[PDB]
Amino acid sequence: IVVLKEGTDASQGKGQIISNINACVAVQEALKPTLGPLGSDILIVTSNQKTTISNDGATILKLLDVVHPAAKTLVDISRAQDAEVGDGTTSVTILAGELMKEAKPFLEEGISSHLIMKGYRKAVSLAVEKINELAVDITSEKSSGRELLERCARTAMSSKLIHNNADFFVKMCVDAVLSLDRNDLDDKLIGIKKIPGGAMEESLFINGVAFKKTFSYAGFEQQPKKFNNPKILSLNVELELKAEKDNAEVRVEHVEDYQAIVDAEWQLIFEKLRQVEETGANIVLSKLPIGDLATQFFADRNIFCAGRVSADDMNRVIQAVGGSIQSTTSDIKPEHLGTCALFEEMQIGSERYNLFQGCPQAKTCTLLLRGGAEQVIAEVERSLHDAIMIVKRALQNKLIVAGGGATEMEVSKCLRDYSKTIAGKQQMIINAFAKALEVIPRQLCENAGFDAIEILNKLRLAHSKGEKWYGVVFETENIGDNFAKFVWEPALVKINALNSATEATNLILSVDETITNKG
Amino acid sequence: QNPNAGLFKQGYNSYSNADGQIIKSIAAIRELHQMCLTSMGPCGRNKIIVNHLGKIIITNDAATMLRELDIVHPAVKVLVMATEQQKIDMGDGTNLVMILAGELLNVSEKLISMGLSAVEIIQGYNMARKFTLKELDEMVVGEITDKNDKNELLKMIKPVISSKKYGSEDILSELVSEAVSHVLPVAQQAGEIPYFNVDSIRVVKIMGGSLSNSTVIKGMVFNREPEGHVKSLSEDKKHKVAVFTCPLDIANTETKGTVLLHNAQEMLDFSKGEEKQIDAMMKEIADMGVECIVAGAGVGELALHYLNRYGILVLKVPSKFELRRLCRVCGATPLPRLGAPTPEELGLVETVKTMEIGGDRVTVFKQEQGEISRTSTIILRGATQNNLDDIERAIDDGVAAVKGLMKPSGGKLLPGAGATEIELISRITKYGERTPGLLQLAIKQFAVAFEVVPRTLAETAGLDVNEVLPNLYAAHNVTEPGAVKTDHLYKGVDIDGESDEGVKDIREENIYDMLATKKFAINVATEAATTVLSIDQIIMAKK
Amino acid sequence: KDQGNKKRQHGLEAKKSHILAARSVASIIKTSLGPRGLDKILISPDGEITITNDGATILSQMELDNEIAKLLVQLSKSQDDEIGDGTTGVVVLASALLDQALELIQKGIHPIKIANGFDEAAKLAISKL
């Protein structure tokens, strides 16, 4: 009659560890096509009904929301990969899951997982030491300031639809990173706006901030769109004649009183409307719509206004001209105003776009992209995001290691020799760790269409011949040196990946039982 | 067609004891016993606990598991209550009670299958318990002088960090021992007033850095910023602090006293009223020597203006739980009214400043070598927020383990790492064959039940049980030509991650178990095993 | 959260299901492509019955949960603003490339080589026109 769990499912034993292994393979198998710049993209449909397609492991695992506890640990460690580094969230989960696959036959042989986890901790400790030996300090050495940024951005943009126009896109990509303080570089500070229509090579770089120009209200052919030093005013409240929401009940029996209450509704609005002119600002920006009466009164005094501007764009305006948002039109102070070097409304893409240009106080920028289709430009923007992260980390981190299979093979190469000196179960565990490091160069060839059998075996040949820098060429299929091909990643990525993947692996291998309470 | 007999109560399922119901009760414990076998030890395993609120929890401590599990069966429920007996009176040894009491019932199945009466089984363990407690008093090797030195505290804390957080054992030991020595006074020949409360050590954490960058503060740290324009106090000694329950504003009535507004003429008088009254009250506070005012409630705008001209640091603590421990450092008392900072309610603080911890600015509360503090703070740093929270749970259990070092005979120690359990095997079996009667059956099996502790640590460490265990038995069996026995009391169970021909000694790493922890664990494990053996049947009713 | 109501198509059986699903949606408007093409009866959610061969109307009136077919709707949505008369022609042409891609998958050719193959195929055909 009595029950221990009161109907709360709890399972233990070696079968629970196997169930944790199958969960790590399921998460790995989903991220395998998303590994590498040429890797395939995953189709994810969230319960929010927003269909997204991306290859970035961070965004992928955040939108899946896997309830499985052992599989959720691989998601939590991927968010740590997005925190400590921010790049490589796809490879850290695949490598951690591969450690679960290589530890599966050891569980059937009767080898305890604690000796397996202890073997990885000694393997990573030797692996990080080899990465420090593979860390090459380079700043001005055999490279200039311009060639270091350009030649590294061309490789990230290679094998893409932008390959032919890459010469123009590297110039805007390098100038985008140099437009910000090299001490603190944030990808969020670089704005990117997609412009439908037009040629890809005609894209422009804006030093200031731009937005969509969502103003739908009539009164056009006025309010000149080109200003030299406009005074930008950030507004909150609603200046439209006929208001959005509220109202009032007024009972009057006279005809002159009918026109009076209509003029009263006008005078109450015109009061705060005239206070905008008393500030003497040429640009009026508000997150709420600016009605026909307001845009007409601004047209007579030659004041430009745009309503219903996104909040994300208004925050960049504050970071551009150094202004501030004031709630009312009365108390507006002079320091809340701001000014740019040039203001123009561009018709590029058969659509009107307001832009601020030449802001000396701007901590952010905006880069416009053009193309024949909105989906193609989105691929250009994401291929640019991969190029920005390489250019950004090049200045922030001067210690680099050869990527694209180069470093992955050298770490796996030496640990096979280090395992010869160690005897016992730890020898087969280190050999399994070095074998688990072979999944990274493998999936890079499988996702790009290259043959995994020939290229990997040929890579194991020349790399064993005394040259440590041989990677996998992503352009023309062959083995080659990525140090010459300029495939570069900082040493902190390879160190934090081996530390985070083994950590998440050690947390899952240490779980004998999963207790889930229902309620 | 088939009638029913034996159940006269109501429609139920009747379980007679002739079917081995007492064995089925132990079998239900064996399901839970195997859960604790992967817990104890630094090589133990962590269990994923999904809370009923949809929260993921991964921890080694089994007391959290039993708290999240809802128990019905009595033999398991008594072990849960027995775990609370070990959890309330001590902050360590919870896995010792669950594993030992489970094995005592496992070896009892051989006596039950033999036909030995349950009462005669209980009588055997009770006589063997008195033989064990007599040995546990003689198993004591060293004892701490209560010098409270840092190195002396490391000897106690080092084995406590083990079995919970491994690899941080040496790093966390320097962090915990420093915080204990701050709130632990050095005194002797006084047993009237208890010392070292659990609340004496506060633990905070922040993302970033690692355990190497962690620091220990001699006082409590507040997360809130110095709202007032005075960021920190001066270098003058003994700054007076004031804790006010009433918010900082114009003087009001203790009962109600809500300010109402009617006409704009009153608002002009309310402004000037708050200007003169606050400036009059805050000036008298500064004249009495109080440079810091702790406000448990809100602070007005004019209250900030006048205190900044007097150089008084404004510090707000809306949490009443932090104010309770705050009174244990300086000694200040909260005042329900405002304007009368009685010097008996005023405290003393050496230093109040603002430090940057993990990128965020925090205002601390601390002292240097004066007006001894009963509350300390451990600032933890780490890259993983989940693992950093588990370190906090390991430190909090380490603080409650130092509580066992107080007056109730906590200085004496016994060899740990499975060294004590092996010697008790030879001592009890010596009493088994020596004591005549049927008790020799249960007494000898009582010593065999201690073989689970060395075997559990060996199974979790991946070591061969067919090797370490028989070598550990021969390690304590020697022939000494004399009364005093020698050679080796120090052979334990081996923790190796890098092998080692044979086993090591306790004297090398100084890893031991406390007497107050071991002696209390034996009493709880036997009473829990006695309770299960005392139940030969169950009775239930319709809910 | 909510492990149920989540399906995953990956690897072998995913590529075959994607092409056949896009073929069924394309086979709808194949017979509607031309000057002689056949009409269809479309029923609005309010109950109004309309008969038209316009592809922009048929693809918009059709409510489908297929994500691969939603990409076909986005294909006709972007070209409708640019042109508007190639609605039914671009989907049949794209599905014809998918039908030939499915045959290449069965031959052992990776989808990346197929995508790079159709890319050089368009650049060559544009130069000829």
Tab-separated table of C-alpha atoms in Angstrom, chain A residues 155-305:
chain	number	residue	atom	x	y	z
A	155	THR	CA	38.978	34.986	-45.168
A	156	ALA	CA	35.819	35.187	-43.046
A	157	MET	CA	33.979	36.643	-46.054
A	158	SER	CA	35.393	34.036	-48.449
A	159	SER	CA	33.231	31.255	-49.919
A	160	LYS	CA	30.153	33.504	-49.693
A	161	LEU	CA	27.788	35.295	-52.058
A	162	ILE	CA	29.762	38.467	-51.229
A	163	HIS	CA	33.008	36.928	-52.500
A	164	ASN	CA	33.121	39.169	-55.580
A	165	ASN	CA	32.027	42.347	-53.728
A	166	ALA	CA	34.131	41.442	-50.684
A	167	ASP	CA	36.622	44.183	-51.588
A	168	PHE	CA	33.986	46.830	-50.842
A	169	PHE	CA	32.592	45.047	-47.780
A	170	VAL	CA	35.960	44.685	-46.028
A	171	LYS	CA	36.432	48.461	-46.229
A	172	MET	CA	33.125	49.080	-44.445
A	173	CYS	CA	33.808	46.255	-41.980
A	174	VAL	CA	37.262	47.535	-41.006
A	175	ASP	CA	36.016	51.123	-40.764
A	176	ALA	CA	33.146	49.950	-38.546
A	177	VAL	CA	35.507	48.492	-35.936
A	178	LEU	CA	37.887	51.469	-36.154
A	179	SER	CA	34.914	53.815	-35.690
A	180	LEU	CA	34.816	52.668	-32.049
A	181	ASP	CA	37.304	52.946	-29.196
A	182	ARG	CA	39.760	50.055	-29.526
A	183	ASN	CA	39.853	49.653	-25.724
A	184	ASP	CA	36.183	48.609	-25.528
A	185	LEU	CA	34.575	47.004	-28.598
A	186	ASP	CA	30.924	45.926	-28.518
A	187	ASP	CA	29.059	44.328	-31.419
A	188	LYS	CA	25.884	45.992	-30.129
A	189	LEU	CA	27.456	49.423	-30.732
A	190	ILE	CA	27.748	48.682	-34.477
A	191	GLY	CA	24.320	49.182	-36.003
A	192	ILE	CA	23.209	47.390	-39.157
A	193	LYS	CA	20.113	48.349	-41.147
A	194	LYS	CA	18.889	46.267	-44.083
A	195	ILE	CA	17.734	48.249	-47.126
A	196	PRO	CA	15.576	46.233	-49.579
A	197	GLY	CA	16.483	46.807	-53.218
A	198	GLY	CA	19.531	48.281	-54.869
A	199	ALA	CA	22.973	46.985	-55.736
A	200	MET	CA	25.125	45.245	-53.110
A	201	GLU	CA	28.229	47.317	-53.963
A	202	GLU	CA	26.476	50.677	-53.388
A	203	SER	CA	26.044	50.180	-49.627
A	204	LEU	CA	27.129	53.101	-47.448
A	205	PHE	CA	28.611	53.431	-43.955
A	206	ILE	CA	27.046	55.961	-41.578
A	207	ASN	CA	29.104	57.477	-38.768
A	208	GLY	CA	25.936	58.268	-36.812
A	209	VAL	CA	22.614	56.489	-36.263
A	210	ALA	CA	19.768	55.912	-38.733
A	211	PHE	CA	16.254	54.513	-38.449
A	212	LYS	CA	13.272	53.352	-40.477
A	213	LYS	CA	11.376	56.653	-40.835
A	214	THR	CA	8.039	55.171	-39.750
A	215	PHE	CA	6.148	58.480	-40.013
A	216	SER	CA	2.939	57.700	-41.933
A	217	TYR	CA	1.171	61.055	-41.611
A	218	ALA	CA	0.439	63.524	-44.395
A	219	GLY	CA	1.847	67.010	-44.758
A	220	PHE	CA	4.652	66.037	-47.143
A	221	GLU	CA	6.513	68.339	-49.561
A	222	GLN	CA	7.510	70.436	-46.510
A	223	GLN	CA	9.851	70.178	-43.507
A	224	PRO	CA	13.195	70.188	-45.392
A	225	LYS	CA	15.124	66.954	-44.908
A	226	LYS	CA	18.633	68.396	-45.226
A	227	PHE	CA	20.039	70.284	-42.237
A	228	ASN	CA	23.597	71.355	-41.450
A	229	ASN	CA	23.621	71.599	-37.629
A	230	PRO	CA	20.089	70.613	-36.572
A	231	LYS	CA	19.037	70.789	-32.926
A	232	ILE	CA	17.628	67.377	-32.029
A	233	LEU	CA	14.771	67.330	-29.501
A	234	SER	CA	13.623	64.060	-27.925
A	235	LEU	CA	9.925	64.107	-27.059
A	236	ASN	CA	7.545	61.822	-25.151
A	237	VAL	CA	3.926	63.041	-25.177
A	238	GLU	CA	1.477	63.213	-28.092
A	239	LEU	CA	1.033	66.445	-30.079
A	240	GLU	CA	-1.682	65.271	-32.506
A	241	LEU	CA	-4.878	67.292	-32.959
A	242	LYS	CA	-7.352	64.445	-32.418
A	243	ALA	CA	-5.884	62.421	-29.585
A	244	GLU	CA	-5.245	58.670	-29.415
A	245	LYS	CA	-7.139	57.451	-26.339
A	246	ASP	CA	-8.814	59.768	-23.818
A	247	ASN	CA	-11.746	62.150	-24.274
A	248	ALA	CA	-14.148	64.350	-22.319
A	249	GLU	CA	-17.881	65.016	-22.059
A	250	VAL	CA	-18.809	68.662	-22.676
A	251	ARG	CA	-22.435	69.810	-22.960
A	252	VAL	CA	-22.995	73.221	-24.567
A	253	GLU	CA	-26.199	74.574	-26.102
A	254	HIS	CA	-24.679	77.358	-28.245
A	255	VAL	CA	-23.105	77.375	-31.705
A	256	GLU	CA	-20.249	79.662	-30.661
A	257	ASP	CA	-19.607	77.227	-27.806
A	258	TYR	CA	-19.407	74.341	-30.288
A	259	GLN	CA	-16.525	76.080	-32.060
A	260	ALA	CA	-15.090	77.102	-28.680
A	261	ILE	CA	-14.680	73.542	-27.389
A	262	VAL	CA	-13.151	72.536	-30.731
A	263	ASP	CA	-10.732	75.452	-30.433
A	264	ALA	CA	-10.273	74.495	-26.773
A	265	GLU	CA	-9.154	71.014	-27.827
A	266	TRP	CA	-6.869	72.806	-30.285
A	267	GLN	CA	-5.570	75.362	-27.777
A	268	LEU	CA	-4.685	72.719	-25.180
A	269	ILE	CA	-2.663	70.872	-27.825
A	270	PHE	CA	-1.256	74.016	-29.455
A	271	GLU	CA	-0.014	75.185	-26.044
A	272	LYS	CA	2.482	72.340	-25.643
A	273	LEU	CA	2.926	72.403	-29.430
A	274	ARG	CA	4.114	76.022	-29.436
A	275	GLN	CA	6.479	75.232	-26.553
A	276	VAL	CA	8.367	72.978	-28.976
A	277	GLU	CA	9.105	76.019	-31.140
A	278	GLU	CA	10.108	78.056	-28.080
A	279	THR	CA	12.890	75.510	-27.570
A	280	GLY	CA	14.092	76.286	-31.099
A	281	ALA	CA	14.924	72.744	-32.203
A	282	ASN	CA	15.022	71.646	-35.838
A	283	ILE	CA	14.571	67.889	-35.216
A	284	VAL	CA	11.670	66.564	-33.128
A	285	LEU	CA	11.840	62.854	-32.292
A	286	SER	CA	9.256	60.978	-30.242
A	287	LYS	CA	8.398	57.354	-29.514
A	288	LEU	CA	4.725	58.339	-29.913
A	289	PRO	CA	3.066	59.554	-33.129
A	290	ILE	CA	3.379	63.196	-34.154
A	291	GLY	CA	0.036	64.158	-35.667
A	292	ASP	CA	-0.965	66.215	-38.693
A	293	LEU	CA	-1.436	69.422	-36.690
A	294	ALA	CA	2.039	69.128	-35.171
A	295	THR	CA	3.844	68.288	-38.414
A	296	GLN	CA	2.017	71.152	-40.146
A	297	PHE	CA	2.976	73.690	-37.473
A	298	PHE	CA	6.551	72.398	-37.670
A	299	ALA	CA	6.439	72.833	-41.452
A	300	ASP	CA	5.729	76.572	-41.307
A	301	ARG	CA	8.747	77.140	-39.027
A	302	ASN	CA	10.804	74.619	-41.046
A	303	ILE	CA	11.098	72.082	-38.223
A	304	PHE	CA	11.499	68.406	-39.118
A	305	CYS	CA	9.732	65.732	-37.087
